[PDB]
Design a protein around this ligand. Structure first.
Ligand code: HEM
Length: 151
């Protein structure tokens, strides 16, 4: 489990993200889609986007970026007790969206990359390690529910 100190590092940089949820959301999804094209195919709404420029110009994509980061933010603030927030997400992503745990690892990588680019001063090695731990916890817990459902 994460220590109190680790959670503080996570929430300190996350407070910076919430200052511009929409901007971060775009960068993260675009990074995810460009680095792992198979993830873009999971979105009927975004399949038509064939270039980074098209992705950046999509208001709909920007809208989803906010939805994603807002859900993640709520989870992170619950620290070591995010059971309630995780249940709905795990269910929909396992049964409706069909998102393998591997894709969650991909988006975790996208999140860390963007945080480094936008907040280097509050995202040094210690903070980076802490965020990695928090995102690993997120994945592990979702994985547990996936195994439960048999996905
Ligand atoms: C940080 C990790 C993620 C969070 C917090 C997150 C959160 C959400 C939320 C809140 C919704 C809308 C409500 C719902 O359907 O449950 C959603 C929808 C969706 N997510 Fe995620 N998601 C994450 C990662 C992913 C990944 C990695 C993929 C695909 C590779 C994905 C694919 C989808 C799809 C396809 C939908 C449905 C979109 C629609 O029909 O409009 N999500 N996600």
């Amino acid at each position: 489990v994460l220590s109190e100190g680790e959670w503080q590092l996570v929430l300190h940089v996350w407070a910076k993200v919430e200052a511009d949820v929409a901007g971060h959301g775009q960068d993260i999804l675009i990074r995810l889609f460009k680095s792992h094209p198979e993830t873009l195919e999971k979105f009927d709404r975004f399949k038509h986007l064939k270039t980074e420029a098209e992705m950046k110009a999509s208001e709909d994509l920007k809208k989803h970026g906010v939805t994603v980061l807002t859900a993640l933010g709520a989870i992170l603030k619950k620290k070591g007790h995010h059971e309630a927030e995780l249940k709905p997400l795990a269910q929909s992503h396992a049964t409706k969206h069909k998102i393998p745990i591997k894709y969650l690892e991909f988006i975790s990588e996208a999140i860390i990359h963007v945080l480094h680019s936008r907040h280097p001063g509050d995202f040094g090695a210690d903070a980076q390690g802490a965020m990695n731990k928090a995102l690993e916890l997120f994945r592990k817990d979702i994985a547990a529910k996936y195994k439960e459902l048999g996905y």
